Design a protein around this ligand. Structure first.
Ligand code: CL
Length: 113
């Protein structure tokens, strides 16, 4: 059941193309905020694992973030990690993660943002 949801989620996320954009600069002051600007400008979802990681990076800081990591590089890093999260995880692993995290749907993008 969770397993079917994981399988359908992952089968879908694995095929979503990474957008082709060299020549982008999105100023930002938190990782989660940069991710919201990316999801809105490109009209893309980011994966559960990427949303969780972005929130951890923001927690680890507790100066504008974009004066520390340039936006072009920051955005590229999110896309590269997102590609790992789309192409590599097994749905079984995702089902197991979701079974242990009652808040897990808060890190899944809505279908209609
Ligand atoms: Cl931001």
């Amino acid at each position: 059941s969770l397993l079917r949801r994981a399988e359908m989620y992952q089968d879908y996320m694995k095929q979503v193309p990474i957008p082709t954009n060299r020549g982008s600069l999105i100023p930002f002051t938190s990782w989660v905020g940069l991710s919201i600007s990316m999801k809105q400008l490109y009209g893309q979802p980011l994966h559960y694992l990427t949303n969780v990681l972005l929130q951890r990076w923001d927690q680890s800081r507790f100066q504008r973030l974009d004066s520390i990591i340039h936006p072009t590089k920051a955005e590229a890093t999110i896309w590269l990690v997102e590609e790992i999260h789309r192409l590599t995880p097994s749905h079984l692993h995702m089902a197991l993660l979701w079974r242990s995290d009652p808040m897990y749907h808060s890190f899944i993008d809505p279908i209609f943002p």
